[PDB]
Amino acid sequence: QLNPSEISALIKQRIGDLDTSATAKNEGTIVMVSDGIVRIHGLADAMYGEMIEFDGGLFGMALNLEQDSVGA
Amino acid sequence: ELLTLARPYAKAAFAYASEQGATDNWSNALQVLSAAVQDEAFSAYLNRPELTPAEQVKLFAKVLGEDQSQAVSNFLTLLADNDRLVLLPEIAAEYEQLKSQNNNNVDVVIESAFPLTAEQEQLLKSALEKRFNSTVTVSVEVKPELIAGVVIRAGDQVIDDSALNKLEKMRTRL
Amino acid sequence: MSSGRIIQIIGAVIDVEFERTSVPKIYDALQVDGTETTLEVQQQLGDGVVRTIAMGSTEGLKRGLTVTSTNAPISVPVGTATLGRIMDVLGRPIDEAGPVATEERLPIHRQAPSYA
Amino acid sequence: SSGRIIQIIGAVIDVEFERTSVPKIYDALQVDGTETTLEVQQQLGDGVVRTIAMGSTEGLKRGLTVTSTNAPISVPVGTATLGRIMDVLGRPIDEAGPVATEERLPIHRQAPSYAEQAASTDLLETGIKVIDLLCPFAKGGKVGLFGGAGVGKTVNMMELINNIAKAHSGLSVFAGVGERTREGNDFYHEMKDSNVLDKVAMVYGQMNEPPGNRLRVALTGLTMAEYFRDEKDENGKGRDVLLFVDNIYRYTLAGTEVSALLGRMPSAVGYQPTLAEEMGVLQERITSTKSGSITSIQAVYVPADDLTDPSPATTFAHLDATVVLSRDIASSGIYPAIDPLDSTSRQLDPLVVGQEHYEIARAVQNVLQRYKELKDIIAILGMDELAEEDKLVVYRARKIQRFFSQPFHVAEVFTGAPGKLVPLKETIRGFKGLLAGEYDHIPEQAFYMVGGIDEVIAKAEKL
Ligand SMILES: Nc1ncnc2c1ncn2[C@@H]1O[C@H](COP(=O)(O)OP(=O)(O)O)[C@@H](O)[C@H]1O
Ligand SMILES: [Mg+2]
């Protein structure tokens, strides 16, 4: 009944906005800012050491690709 | 580490449920919540950085449907503030263990080399009652990897009479 | 809203929690409602929390106290009216000779002149 | 089955597999889309392993599928690796084509047991005055060349190769561990200009590569040497094997860089807590056993000219003869810069080198020590406050210090003078005379950059 319970959850919560349309794999949201180092959330396709461009035209270098957050 | 951090929440939940006489409802709710948080898509939609704890509690209320109450809502709100929502499955496991212990019911698993019929299972159930519990929940499991014999697992206690005899004799040979 | 509340005090380091939409920039100056005390933002810890350094004594400050923001770094008075006066870091007269007579302010955190 | 990447922190990837098919501790994994190869280091549980990368980690996503090989890193061995340049994974990088062998051996292996420990003392004459007189070598023993940055470890090693390997009848292995690529190219072209390229096998994980390459590189270099040692040709005996390593310190340095990333508390200075063990595991495979003998030469870097640093201070216990270079001597113009008071060897005892040689060496060291002690008084006070014996000792000690200088066969590029090769008997005879006082009438400038004692007299007469 555990897998049927999971299916019941999938029914009660319909699709969840398609997870905000897969949350747009090439997207993020700044979480922490300190001393020129920031942490971004949700850059699923962030490749190690690539250029991340923010909203003002700046650029960043990804340093840590952790399980849930991307340092820069 | 995860099990250590789940002691107080599980103990408090069990104490409240036992004092309110609603242990079954909390057990069902906790299993549902553990299954929900185990899901990948739901967890991804839950850890969105825009959500306040109230939003997460409301989302849990929506997915849970009925069986919710002020008690479960308050419990989830308290969990969300400290960001301990991720460790719900350990809380559920601890709660189930405490409920089984309070009812004097222990779980056993009987693993054999051949499928068992009714009389052997009943005989073993009667034998294990000499551990002086309320009941045993025997979950039989066949293993062709073994050759013969039955191994019973009760918590951390195991009783072996199977092919492990061969390894025990091998060590004594060498 | 810009207003937020204090949630932690450790000596001279005070934390403030804003709602997640209105977290202020780094080096913004915050004013504590009901008292005279200016806090400077040092880093953003996420989830609407901001860690600040207090400019003055912190005794008598308690948690859950409303704090308002200025949306700009510390501003000081400039001009010819500042000649012959004594001022603290926040740009206030400590020579006991009345308020500074100028109107022009500037932020104290600005970029160094470029190469060109 | 196959797993996927969930973190990338510098050179330390980590993968999540199924609960059933987790790999072993030193298995090898291959990223599907690329050529990066991973080696498991830790096993974090819950179907997660933590590996390091044998290549560059630029442009790696999270979620790339990873497949396992269920076997450690395997390198080719045999005679097909002779005269070839190879990388960490044993892939040819000299563009001569693939290696023509089928043999394989894992690079992770236990040291030989204590039962199979054959230790011999058969002297080896290198033709260098200070090395022969003070710290003699032994065929089958481990040697080290301690020294700072730029005091001449590599030049001394290339000199010892010239005096031994060219006349050596037996194979060799050169393993560069984090060094200049220019030096590797120069060595390759020097061997190829001569005809002794068919007697060496080269492994180069150099100083421009990620720490994964520099870490597990010496292991391949001596994996080949182990096979060369433990080999028998029918109607033939075992082959004597040389082994030259360059800056074995870089092996531990590359382990320090990935220490914190593996989740360990730092040790005394900055080193990993497993420094001594991870040095011993490597150093215990270099010994020589009942079948075959491995003569080893190792240059060991010394950080910040500090012989107390944990890694050089840990390496001392693993060597038979320790040659310590000094920056002061090199800055004084004396080459080689070998310090005569820190160089030692287990082979310097009367029962091995004879009574006369031992007495000469001890007398030389005593004279140098007394001069080192007098050096402080003659600075504050004058040279004329001392007695006559002390002045005589000072003059003799300066002459001795000069006489240890020598023009190498490979150093004629820097200076221009041709090299010299001094037999042991000439060194002993010269130093006996110099201690007896026979040469008190020779100016000390005649003992500088010369061979045997006859060149000293000839140069004195020319002056
Ligand atoms: N035997 C020697 N006699 C005179 N000069 C030397 C001698 N060996 C090295 N030098 C010089 O001293 C330096 C030695 O550096 P090198 O042997 O190449 O490597 P390392 O950095 O390990 O000391 C070089 O500049 C070399 O020209
Ligand atoms: Mg060097």
Domain CATH for B92: 1.10.520.20
Q: Return the amino acid letter for D405.
A: S
Q: How far apart are CA D18 and CA D47, in angstroms?
A: 6
Q: Return the amino acid letter for B43.
A: S
Question: Which residue in the set A5, A19, A41 is minimally distant from B32, CB to CB?
Answer: A5
| Binding site membership of D152 for ligand 1 (Cβ less than 6 Å) | yes
Q: How big is chain C, counted in residues?
A: 116
Taking CA–CA distances from C47, the nearest residue in chain B reads B49
Residue D256 has, within 13 A of its CA and on its CB side, a CA count of 16
- Contact residues for D267 (Cβ-Cβ < 8 A; gap 6+): D273, D275, D310
Q: How far apart are CA D312 and CA D332, in angstroms?
A: 24
| DSSP conformation class of D32 | S
- The answer to whether the CB of D409 falls within 8 A of the CB of D162 is yes
Strands (E), D48-166: 48-53, 65-68, 74-76, 85-86, 104-106, 123-124, 137-138, 142-147
- Contact residues for D371 (Cβ-Cβ < 8 A; gap 6+): D393, D394, D397, D398
User: At which residue do the structure tokens 């920056």 appear?
Assistant: D327
| DSSP conformation class of D239 | P
**D318/D184 same-domain check:** yes
Q: Where are the domains of chain A?
A: 1-72
Resolution of the structure in the document, Å: 3.1
- Bridge partner list, A5: none
Q: What proportions of chain A, in percent to the nearest 5, are helix, strand and coil?
A: 25, 30, 45
Q: How far apart are CA D225 and CA D245, in angstroms?
A: 12
Q: How far apart are CA B142 and CA D315, in angstroms?
A: 56
Q: Angle C46-C50-C52 (CA atoms, 0-180°, nearest 5)?
A: 150
Helices B7-20 and B70-81: angle between axes, nearest 10 degrees: 170
Give the domain range for residue D460: 348-463
| Binding site membership of D336 for ligand 1 (Cβ less than 6 Å) | yes
**Residue D176 annotated as lining a ligand binding site:** no
Element (H, E) at D249: helix D249-257
Helices D355-374 and D388-403: angle between axes, nearest 10 degrees: 120
Q: How far apart are CA B149 and CA B166, in angstroms?
A: 12
Whether the CB of C99 is below 8 Å from some CB of chain A: the reply is no
Method in brief? cryo-EM
Element (H, E) at B158: strand B157-159
Q: After which residues is chain D broken (C to N over 2.5 A)?
A: none
**D318/D381 same-domain check:** no
> Is D62 close to A46, i.e. CB distance below 8 A?
yes
Domain stops at, among D42, D72, D102: D72
Counted across chains B and C, CB pairs separated by less than 8 A come out at: 3
Q: Which of D299, D295, D274 is nearest to D286 (CA)?
A: D295
User: At which residue do the structure tokens 């020779």 appear?
Assistant: D442
3-class state of residue D414 by DSSP = coil
Out of D153, D229, D250, D396, which one is annotated catalytic? D153
> Is B36 close to A9, i.e. CB distance below 8 A?
yes
- Bridge partner list, C69: C30
Element (H, E) at B157: strand B157-159
- Bridge partner list, A40: A30, A70
In the residue annotation, D153 being an active-site residue is answered as yes
Q: Would you state the structure tokens that stand for residue D383, as one six-digit string? A: 């040279």
Q: Which of D416, D414, D345, D369 is nearest to D150 (CA)?
A: D414
Q: Would you state the structure tokens that stand for residue D275, as one six-digit string? A: 């420094």
| Binding site membership of D153 for ligand 1 (Cβ less than 6 Å) | yes
Q: Which of D85, D246, D225 is nearest to D157 (CA)?
A: D246
Q: Would you state the structure tokens that stand for residue D394, as one six-digit string? A: 């000072």
Residue D132 phi/psi, 5-degree rounding, is -70, -40
Alpha helices by DSSP H, listed for chain B, are 2-5, 7-20, 23-38, 40-46, 53-64, 70-81, 88-102, 118-128, 164-173
| DSSP conformation class of B50 | T
Strands (E), D206-257: 241-246
How far away, in angstroms, is D150 Cα from ligand 1 center?
A: 6
In the residue annotation, D257 being an active-site residue is answered as no
Q: Which of C37, C33, C31 is nearest to C12 (CA)?
A: C37
Whether the CB of B36 is below 8 Å from some CB of chain A: the reply is yes
Give the number of the atom of ligand 1 that is nearest the alpha carbon of residue D408. 1
Give the number of the atom of ligand 1 that is nearest the alpha carbon of residue D299. 22
Dihedral over alpha carbons A55, A56, A59, A62 (to 10 degrees): -30
Q: Are strands C38-46 and C49-55 parallel, antiparallel or unpaired?
A: antiparallel
Q: Are strands C29-32 and A59-61 parallel, antiparallel or unpaired?
A: unpaired
- The answer to whether the CB of C29 falls within 8 A of the CB of C12 is no
Strands (E), D139-293: 142-147, 172-177, 200-205, 241-246
Give the domain range for residue B81: 2-100
What is each CA distance from D417 to D330, D413, D414, D420, D451, in whole angstroms? 18, 8, 9, 9, 12
Let me know if chains C and D touch, i.e. at least 3 Cβ pairs under 8 angstroms.
no
Minimum-distance ligand to the CA of D413? 1
Q: Which of D179, D212, D204 is nearest to D301 (CA)?
A: D179
Q: How far apart are CA D413 and CA D411, in angstroms?
A: 5
Whether the CB of C25 is below 8 Å from some CB of chain B: the reply is no
What is each CA distance from B141 to B116, B138, C20, in whole angstroms? 9, 10, 52
Element (H, E) at D299: strand D294-301
Touching subunits for chain A (3+ Cβ pairs under 8 A)? B, C, D
How far away, in angstroms, is D336 Cα from ligand 1 center?
A: 8
Name chain C contacts of B52, Cβ cutoff 8 Å.
Answer: 20
How does DSSP assign C7-59, residue by residue?
A: EEEETTEEEEE--TT-PPPTT-EEEETTS--EEEEEEEEETTEEEEEEES--T
In the residue annotation, D159 being an active-site residue is answered as no
Q: How far apart are CA D428 and CA D426, in angstroms?
A: 6
Whether the CB of A2 is below 8 Å from some CB of chain C: the reply is no
**D181/D302 same-domain check:** yes
> Is D7 close to A66, i.e. CB distance below 8 A?
yes
Number of domains in chain D: 3
Q: How far apart are CA D341 and CA B82, in angstroms?
A: 65
Element (H, E) at D28: strand D28-31
| Binding site membership of D395 for ligand 1 (Cβ less than 6 Å) | no
Q: Are strands D2-9 and D12-16 parallel, antiparallel or unpaired?
A: antiparallel
Give the domain range for residue C27: 1-73
- Contact residues for A24 (Cβ-Cβ < 8 A; gap 6+): none
Q: How far apart are CA D340 and CA D350, in angstroms?
A: 19
What is each CA distance from D279 to B134, B163, D174, D181, D317, in whole angstroms? 58, 42, 19, 25, 11
Measuring from atom 2 of ligand 1, which residue has the nearest CA?
A: D335
- The answer to whether the CB of D40 falls within 8 A of the CB of D4 is no
Distance from CA of A16 to the nearest CA of D (A): 23
Give the number of the atom of ligand 1 that is nearest the alpha carbon of residue D335. 3
Whether the CB of B100 is below 8 Å from some CB of chain A: the reply is no
Domain stops at, among D33, D57, D72: D72
- Contact residues for A10 (Cβ-Cβ < 8 A; gap 6+): none
The CB density around residue B81, as the number of other CB atoms within 10 Å, is: 11
> Is D58 close to A48, i.e. CB distance below 8 A?
yes
Whether the CB of A37 is below 8 Å from some CB of chain C: the reply is no
Helices B70-81 and B23-38: angle between axes, nearest 10 degrees: 40
Question: Which residue in the set A6, A17, A42 is minimally distant from B35, CB to CB?
Answer: A6
Element (H, E) at D301: strand D294-301
The verdict on domain A1-72 having CATH code 2.40.30.20 is: yes
| Binding site membership of D326 for ligand 1 (Cβ less than 6 Å) | no
Measuring from atom 15 of ligand 1, which residue has the nearest CA?
A: D152
3-class state of residue D140 by DSSP = coil
Alpha helices by DSSP H, listed for A1-72, are 2-12, 16-22
Domain stops at, among D347, D382, D408: D347
